[PDB]
């Protein structure tokens, strides 16, 4: 169960 | 279950 | 089950 | 159990 | 169970 | 004379992987 | 004479890799 | 004569790495 | 003559990597 | 007069081998 | 009067070998 | 003649690692 | 006169080997 | 005249070698 | 006249081998 | 001789074996 | 000889295997 | 001789196996 | 001889191995 | 002789194995 | 200059 | 200059 | 100049 | 220079 | 110069 999960890179 | 995952990259 | 995952790329 | 993991990087 | 967690690298 | 400009090689890829796999019985 | 630019060799990759594994029963 | 300008050899990779695992009876 | 500009060699990855492993009875 | 000039290589390999096999339901 | 100039090689490889196999449902 | 800028090797990782591990009956 | 320039290599693999393998459900 | 110049070498590996295997549910 | 030069090396490999296994659920 | 030039190589060669090596399903 | 130039190489020579040997799968 | 240059080499071989080497399932 | 440069070496080989060797699944 | 030149070598070698060796899962 | 894995997999 | 794993799998 | 993991997994 | 593992895992 | 690990698990 995931939820919401953010992965970001800059 | 996935929900909202999110994978971003710049 | 998936529900909204976004692989965005820039 | 995942609710609203944040996982960035600059 | 995992609620809110933050991974952040500058 | 003989001389060049700014010469620049950029490779910038932006790739899409995504693996899904699922076995039920 | 002879001279050249200011060169710039730039490597950015932008990978989005996503691994989906299940095995129900 | 014979000069170069201000080079710059820059790698910046930015990956987005995620396994999901998952085994159910 | 035969000089150099400002050189400079940057490596900056920037990686996310999340590993989800779950087994259930 | 010898200027080697600029020499400048980037590897930047993206192997994503993904694999599920041997799963035996009896 | 020698100058080697600019020589800028970029390997960037997209490997995606993705196999689901030796699934026995029996 | 035959000098150089200043130089940078800059090395500057940012990584994010996550292991999730879960074994229920 | 001998200038040796610039040699600037930048090596960044992204291997992402993923394997979900030999799960026996008897 | 002998200026050996600047050599820059950067090696950043990212292996994310990731594996579930032997999961008997008997 | 011999400069050396400047000669700069960077190792910052990242392995993030993770694995589950030898689970036996009976 | 007289070989002048840099030499500048990438060297990245792929082998992906995904197979089934003596497997006697059911 | 007067091999005159910057050797600046890359060998990153990548070998996946994912495989089944001498498995009886039921 | 005369070998006149700068030497800035990388050597990252990636070998990743994730195999079932003698098994019996079920 | 006459070997003038510098010498910077980066030796990272990767050898990940997630296997299953003589293993009795049930 | 005449090696002139620096050595600034970086060796990590990284051998990652996470296996199961003789094991009789139930 | 030789490219290519000598690999004998099976 | 040789580039390729010597590899045996099985 | 030798590139390649000798490697026997098996 | 000889760059590789001699792995025998197995 | 010799990079690798003599490794033998198993």
């Keep these: ?4 999960v953010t992965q970001a890179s800059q």
């Design 1 to 4: 169960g995931l939820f919401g």
